Amino acid sequence: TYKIMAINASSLKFQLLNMPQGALLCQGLILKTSTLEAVTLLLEALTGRIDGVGHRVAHGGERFKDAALVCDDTLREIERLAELAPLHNPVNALGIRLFRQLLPAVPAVAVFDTAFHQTLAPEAWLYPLPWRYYAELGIRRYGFHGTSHHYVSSALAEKLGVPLSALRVVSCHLGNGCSVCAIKGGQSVNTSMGFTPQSGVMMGTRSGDIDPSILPWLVEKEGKSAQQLSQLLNNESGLLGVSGVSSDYRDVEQAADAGNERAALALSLFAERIRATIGSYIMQMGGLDALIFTGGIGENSARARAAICRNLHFLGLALDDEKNQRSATFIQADNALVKVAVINTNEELMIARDVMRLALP
Amino acid sequence: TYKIMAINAGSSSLKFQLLNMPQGALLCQGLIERIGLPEARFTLKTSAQKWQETLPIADHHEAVTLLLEALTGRGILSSLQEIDGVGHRVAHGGERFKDAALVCDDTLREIERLAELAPLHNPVNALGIRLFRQLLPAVPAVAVFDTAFHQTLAPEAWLYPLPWRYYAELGIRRYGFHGTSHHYVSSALAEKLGVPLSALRVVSCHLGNGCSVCAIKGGQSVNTSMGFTPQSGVMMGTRSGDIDPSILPWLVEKEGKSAQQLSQLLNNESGLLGVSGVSSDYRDVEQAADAGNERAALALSLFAERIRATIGSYIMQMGGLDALIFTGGIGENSARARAAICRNLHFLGLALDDEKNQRSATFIQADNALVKVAVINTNEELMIARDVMRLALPQ
Ligand SMILES: Nc1ncnc2c1ncn2[C@@H]1O[C@H](COP(=O)(O)OP(=O)(O)NP(=O)(O)O)[C@@H](O)[C@H]1O
Ligand SMILES: Nc1ncnc2c1ncn2[C@@H]1O[C@H](COP(=O)(O)OP(=O)(O)NP(=O)(O)O)[C@@H](O)[C@H]1O
C-alpha cells in the first residue's frame, strides 16, 4: 500500500520499502533490485528503471526524545547540534534539505541515533566531572545505536508475545561499532556509548573506555595532539590495535586459530569488555529476563556469543550448543531461565515505521 | 615481643606507626607534614598522650631524625636497638613485584626504575627507604607495594584495548591500587567467617577519599577498578573515575588544556567536589544534600551508582558472589551509603539488616540473605607490619 524511502547521507545510502509489510523494493548507494547532487541520479533511476522519506540523523542531543517531522525549525535545531556531531549532522540535514526541494511533495521524518536513550536518568548520563562541563557545554552520556536497540528489543517482545515493558532486557549491538543497552519498563535506562560513539566496549578500531589518565600521560610522553589522541581512540585501537591483524572479527578469529597470540587475546578481551557491561546493567535493573545479540557479529558469531555467556548459571543463563551453532532466534538452554535471542537488526525498517507513525497516522 | 614500624613517605609528609607484633598493638603513631614548606608540623600520639609542634623541617632527612629522637626522648623505646624491622609503603611495583620485598641495593633500583609511572610517589618512597637504612643500618626493612596484590590479574583484565605497542613498550595496562587494604580486609573476612578465602567469591569496596573495588576469587585478586593510575575506576572525593575518553581531546581542542591541566581536572576538580560544588568530603556533601542541594544529592546518588556498576561487573566475572566487604572512611561509617549501594539485589540473594547496618555491625546482611556483607576496618599498617614479620623475621 505505502512506499517509504529510508535515507542515510561522503555517501548516500538508500532503501525503498513497501509498507507496512516492509518488503524491500530496492536498495543502493552512491543500485540493486530482486560509476561516474547525487540525489538526482537516485530519483532518476527510480524513474528510468513515494509517500514519505525518513532520514537518519546521528545526534539529537537533549532536544529530540523521539523522531520528528521535518520542518524548517526541526532542521534549524538539527544544524545547531553540529556543535556535538560536526562531521555527520550537517550533511544529514543537507540531505533533508535536498529532499526538501527536489522532492517537495513528500513528508519527511528525522530519526535520531540518540533519541531512544533520552530516558536515561542523571545518575546514568552525568559524568563525575565539574558540573559546568554538563550545564555550560553539554558534555554527558548520549548513547547511540538507538534505532537498532529500539528495533530488536521490540522484535523480541513480539516474538515472546508479551509487552516489552514486562521484561528486563540487555541488548548487545555488536558490529564494527559496538554498544550494549539496558531496557526496563520499555525504556532505555543505560547504554555503553557515551559523549561520542567512541566509548564503551572494545570495537573494530575504537578502544571504548580506558583509564582516562593514560591520555595526559601520552600527551607528555609522546607529545600527542588532540587530533592524534582522537585518531588513537577511534582508528588505531580495538580489535585492530590489540590483534595487529585486522579490525574485522572473522579475520582476527582466523589468525587466533592459526596460533597468533595477540589475536586470541583480542577476542578474549572483546568478550570481557561486553561481559563487564552486561554485568553492570543486570545489577542496575535488579535482574535479567532476556539478552539480545544483533549486528554483524551478534547475529553471526556463535563463538563470540558462547564466550560472552560462559559461566552465568548464577543468573539462570546458559546456551544450547546446537541452537547457538545455527544462530537460531532463541539459543538459550531448554532449562535456562533467561531467554537469549539472536535478532537481525533492520534500522531502515525501524526508520520506515517512524515515517509511518509520524507522517501517515 | 616484636617492635615493627610502618612508614609512608609522601612528597612533603612522613606518616608512621610503631606496632607490637604479632599482636598488632599500636605503641605510637603520628605525622610530620609540610616538610620543606612553612607551617611544618610534627604530631606524635601514644595511647595516653598527644604531642604537636610547628617547627622548621627542611628535608625528609630532618623528619626521620626528629622521629627517631622522639621515640627514645618520649620513653617509648629503651633504645633504637629495640626496633626489630621497618616496613615501607611503596606506591607502584609494576609487573616486577608480585609481593612485598626485603629492601636491598637491588630493590631500590627497581623502585627508582618504576618512577616513570608513579612519578610523584615512588622516588620519595625510595628516599624514605634509603634514609632509614642510613640512620637505622642494623634494622631489616621490607617494601610493601600498593599494586602487588593485583598482579594475579589475567591479561584479559589488565590489557586496555589500545595498540599492543602501548603495553609492550610503554608499560600501559591496569595495575590497580589499595592492594594492601584489599588484601588485609579480605583475609580478615575469611578469619571472621572461619572459612578459607579460597572458598569464597569476594567483592571488596575500599570507599574513602580514594575509592576502589576489587574482586577476590580463590584468594586472588582477579580484577580491580583503578587502572594505569589511581585516578580511574569509580567516582571519588575529587577524582572522576572512568569517563568517556573522547572528552579529553575535546577539552584540549575547546579549552586548550595542557597535559598537567587535564590531569588536575581528573584528579583534583571532579568526583564529589566537582559534582556537588560543595565539598570533597562525603559528610559535607550529605549535609548539603539533606538541606536541599540538588547537586549534592545527585553527587551522592551518582557515587553509589558507579560503585554498583563495578560490583555488577565483578559479580558476573566470578560467576556469582558469596561476600561483599565495605571498608575505608566511607564504607566503614556510612550506613546510608551502604544501603543505597545494596538496594534491590534480590537477584543475588543480597539484602541488609537495617538494625545491624545502622550500628555498623561486622555483618549487616539480612537473616535469610545468601550473601555475607561485612563492615571491616582496614589497617594497612597492620598488614605492612605482618609483611615485615613474614619476610625480615621468619623467626
Ligand atoms: N559471519 C560473521 N562473523 C563474525 N563477524 C562478522 C560476520 N559478518 C560480519 N561480521 C562483522 O560485523 C561487522 C558489521 O558491522 P555493522 O554492524 O554493519 O556496522 P555498524 O555496527 O553499524 N558500525 P557503527 O554504525 O559505527 O556502530 C563487520 O565489520 C564484521 O567485522
Ligand atoms: N562517619 C562518617 N560518615 C560518612 N563518611 C565518613 C565518615 N567518616 C569519614 N567519612 C568519609 O570518609 C572519607 C575518608 O577516607 P579515608 O579512608 O580517610 O581516605 P583514603 O582511603 O586514605 N584515600 P586514599 O589516598 O586513596 O587511600 C572522607 O570522604 C569522609 O567524608
φ/ψ of residue A16, rounded to 5? -100, 125
Asked if the Cβ–Cβ distance from A126 to B302 is below 8 Å, we say yes
Q: What angle do CA B15, B37, B14 make, to 5 degrees?
A: 10
Q: What angle do CA A349, A352, A356 make, to 5 degrees?
A: 135
From A141, A215, A273, residue closest to B245, measured CB to CB: A215
Closest CA to B131 of B300, B14, B256, B296: B14
Cell numbers for A91: 550533511
Distance CA B242, CA B57 (A): 38
Query: How, if at all, do strands B41-46 and B323-327 pair?
Result: unpaired
Which amino acid is present at A144? F
Distance CA A95, CA A12 (A): 8
Ligand 1 centroid – CA A297 distance (Å): 5
CB of A117 closer than 8 Å to CB of A109: no
- Looking at all shown ligands, the one closest to residue A249's CA atom is 1
Ligand 2 centroid – CA A161 distance (Å): 50
Q: What angle do CA A212, A216, A218 make, to 5 degrees?
A: 100
Domain B179-375 fold is: Nucleotidyltransferase; domain 5 (3.30.420)
Q: Whose CA is nearest to atom 2 of ligand 1?
A: A300
Asked if the Cβ–Cβ distance from A213 to B263 is below 8 Å, we say yes
Q: What are the Cα distances from residue B359, in Å, to A35, B115, B311, B367?
A: 76, 43, 24, 16
Identify all chain A residues contacting B172, using CB atoms and an 8 Å cutoff.
214, 217
Query: How, if at all, do strands A108-112 and B50-54 pair?
Result: unpaired
Count of CB pairs separated by less than 8 Å, A with B: 233
> At B155, is the secondary structure helix, strand, or coil?
helix
Which residues have a Cβ under 8 Å from the Cβ of A163 and sit 6 or more positions away? A157, A186
Ligand 2 centroid – CA B229 distance (Å): 20
Distance CA A47, CA A68 (A): 28
Distance CA A202, CA A241 (A): 10
| DSSP H/E element including A246 | none
Distance CA A278, CA A287 (A): 11
Identify all chain A residues contacting B344, using CB atoms and an 8 Å cutoff.
286
The H-assigned helical ranges of chain A are 39-47, 72-80, 89-101, 122-125, 132-135, 146-160, 214-222, 226-235, 238-243, 249-257, 261-285, 295-298, 302-308, 321-326, 347-359
Query: How, if at all, do strands B2-9 and A52-57 pair?
Result: unpaired
Q: Does A122 touch chain B (CB under 8 A)?
A: yes
CB of B246 closer than 8 Å to CB of A233: yes
Distance CA A25, CA A23 (A): 6
Indicate which residue of A113, A209, A251, A321 is catalytic. A113
Distance CA B88, CA B124 (A): 11
Ligand 1 centroid – CA A27 distance (Å): 19
φ/ψ of residue A110, rounded to 5? -105, 130
Query: How, if at all, do strands A108-112 and A68-69 pair?
Result: antiparallel
Q: What are the Cα distances from residue B116, in Å, to B82, B92, B122, B124?
A: 37, 10, 9, 13
CB of A339 closer than 8 Å to CB of A160: yes
Asked if the Cβ–Cβ distance from B347 to A262 is below 8 Å, we say no
The H-assigned helical ranges of A258-329 are 261-285, 295-298, 302-308, 321-326
Query: How, if at all, do strands A2-8 and A52-57 pair?
Result: parallel
**What number of other Cβ atoms are within 10 A of residue B64's Cβ?**
23
CB of A89 closer than 8 Å to CB of A8: no
| DSSP per-residue string spanning B253-308 | HHH---HHHHHHHHHHSSHHHHHHSS-SSHHHHHHHHHTT-HHHHHHHHHHHHHHH
User: Environment class of residue A82 by beta-carbon count within 10 Å: exposed (0-12), middle (13-18) or buried (19+)?
Assistant: middle
Distance CA A353, CA A196 (A): 26
Distance CA B132, CA B88 (A): 10
Query: How, if at all, do strands B2-9 and B85-90 pair?
Result: parallel
From A211, A232, A312, residue closest to B229, measured CB to CB: A211
CA dihedral B204, B208, B210, B214 (to 10 degrees): 0
Distance CA B341, CA B327 (A): 13
Q: What are the Cα distances from residue A28, in Å, to A3, A32, A108, A267?
A: 16, 6, 19, 33
* Adjacent-strand bridge partners of B28: B18, B46
B34 sits in the region (left: phi over 0; alpha: psi -120 to 50; else beta) called: left
Q: What does the DSSP 8-state code read for residue A342?
A: E
Cell numbers for B109: 633500583
Asked if the Cβ–Cβ distance from A215 to B344 is below 8 Å, we say no
Q: What are the Cα distances from residue B250, in Å, to A84, A196, A342, B269?
A: 10, 10, 36, 18
Which residues have a Cβ under 8 Å from the Cβ of A41 and sit 6 or more positions away? A30
Distance CA B282, CA A32 (A): 62
| DSSP H/E element including B121 | none
Q: What does the DSSP 8-state code read for residue A186?
A: T
CB of A197 closer than 8 Å to CB of A59: no
Identify all chain A residues contacting B298, using CB atoms and an 8 Å cutoff.
122-123, 126
From B156, B298, B305, residue closest to A269, measured CB to CB: B156
- Looking at all shown ligands, the one closest to residue A145's CA atom is 1
| DSSP per-residue string spanning A50-83 | --EEEEEES--TTT-SS-EE--HHHHHHHHHGGG
- Looking at all shown ligands, the one closest to residue A8's CA atom is 1
Which amino acid is present at B186? S
Instruction: Give B329-335 contacts, CB < 8 A, sequence gap 24+.
Output: B329/B207, B329/B208, B329/B209, B329/B282, B330/B207, B330/B208, B330/B211, B330/B282, B331/B205, B331/B206, B331/B207, B331/B208, B331/B375, B332/B360, B332/B375, B332/B376, B332/B377, B332/B378, B333/B360, B334/B207, B334/B282, B334/B286, B335/B360
Distance CA A233, CA A238 (A): 8
Distance CA B268, CA A51 (A): 56
Q: Whose CA is nearest to atom 5 of ligand 2?
A: B330
Q: Does B120 touch chain A (CB under 8 A)?
A: no
Which residues have a Cβ under 8 Å from the Cβ of B99 and sit 6 or more positions away? B148
Method: X-ray
* Adjacent-strand bridge partners of B16: B7, B30
CB of B7 closer than 8 Å to CB of B86: yes
- Does A2-143+347-359 match A146-342 in CATH topology? yes
A 259-288 → B contacts, CB under 8 A: 262, 265, 268-273, 275-284, 286-288
> At A228, is the secondary structure helix, strand, or coil?
helix
Distance CA B61, CA B351 (A): 51
Q: Does B183 touch chain A (CB under 8 A)?
A: no
CB of B127 closer than 8 Å to CB of B12: no
Q: Whose CA is nearest to atom 12 of ligand 2?
A: B329
Which amino acid is present at A35? T
- Name the CA radius of gyration of chain B, rounded: 22
φ/ψ of residue B222, rounded to 5? -115, -5
CB of A54 closer than 8 Å to CB of A6: yes
User: Environment class of residue B65 by beta-carbon count within 10 Å: exposed (0-12), middle (13-18) or buried (19+)?
Assistant: middle
Which ligand 2 atom sits nearest the alpha carbon of residue B280?
A: 29
Residue of A nearest to B174 (CA): A211
User: Environment class of residue A135 by beta-carbon count within 10 Å: exposed (0-12), middle (13-18) or buried (19+)?
Assistant: exposed
CB of B242 closer than 8 Å to CB of B189: no
Q: What are the Cα distances from residue B360, in Å, to B114, B166, B208?
A: 39, 44, 16
Closest CA to B131 of B59, B220, B74: B59
Closest CA to A156 of A339, A322, A307, A26: A339
- Residue A147 beta carbon below 6 angstroms from any ligand 1 atom: no
Closest CA to B251 of A219, A121, A334: A219
| DSSP H/E element including A84 | none
Q: Does B250 touch chain A (CB under 8 A)?
A: yes
Closest CA to B317 of B206, B241, B186, B224: B224
CATH number corresponding to A146-342: 3.30.420.40
Q: What does the DSSP 8-state code read for residue B198?
A: G
Which amino acid is present at A165? S
Query: How, if at all, do strands A178-184 and B372-375 pair?
Result: unpaired
Q: What is the sign, positive or negative, of the torsion defined by CA atoms of B285, B247, A125, B177?
A: negative
Chain Cα centroid distance, residue B80: 29
Asked if the Cβ–Cβ distance from A284 to B305 is below 8 Å, we say yes
Q: What angle do CA A114, A120, A122 make, to 5 degrees?
A: 120
Q: Which residue has the cell 618512597?
A: B125
Q: What are the Cα distances from residue A182, in Å, to A285, A289, B137?
A: 8, 11, 60
Q: What are the Cα distances from residue B124, in Å, to A239, A324, A328, B62?
A: 39, 56, 60, 14
Asked if the Cβ–Cβ distance from A283 to B232 is below 8 Å, we say no
Distance CA A241, CA B162 (A): 6
Q: Where are the domains of chain A?
A: 2-143+347-359, 146-342
The H-assigned helical ranges of chain B are 60-73, 105-113, 122-135, 155-158, 164-168, 179-193, 247-255, 259-268, 271-276, 282-290, 294-318, 328-333, 335-342, 354-358, 380-392
Resolution for the entry shown, Å = 2.3
CB of A159 closer than 8 Å to CB of A167: no
Q: What does the DSSP 8-state code read for residue B230?
A: T
Distance CA A149, CA A304 (A): 19
Which residues have a Cβ under 8 Å from the Cβ of B63 and sit 6 or more positions away? B14, B32, B35, B42, B57
Distance CA A295, CA A342 (A): 9
Asked if the Cβ–Cβ distance from A215 to B262 is below 8 Å, we say yes
Closest CA to A325 of A308, A304, A295, A344: A304
Distance CA A238, CA A244 (A): 10
Q: What does the DSSP 8-state code read for residue A32?
A: B
Q: Which residues of B are catalytic?
A: 146
Chain Cα centroid distance, residue B281: 17
> At A218, is the secondary structure helix, strand, or coil?
helix
> At B24, is the secondary structure helix, strand, or coil?
coil
Closest CA to B312 of B340, B345, B336: B345
**What number of other Cβ atoms are within 10 A of residue B234's Cβ?**
28
Q: What are the Cα distances from residue B170, in Å, to A104, B94, B189, B308, B314?
A: 58, 12, 37, 32, 27
Ligand 2 centroid – CA B314 distance (Å): 23
B29 sits in the region (left: phi over 0; alpha: psi -120 to 50; else beta) called: beta
User: Environment class of residue A280 by beta-carbon count within 10 Å: exposed (0-12), middle (13-18) or buried (19+)?
Assistant: buried
Q: CATH homologous superfamily for A2-143+347-359?
A: ATPase, nucleotide binding domain (3.30.420.40)
CB of A19 closer than 8 Å to CB of A4: yes
Sheet holding B2-9, edge to edge: B50-54, B41-46, B25-33, B14-21, B2-9, B85-90, B141-145, B101-102
Distance CA A177, CA A196 (A): 12
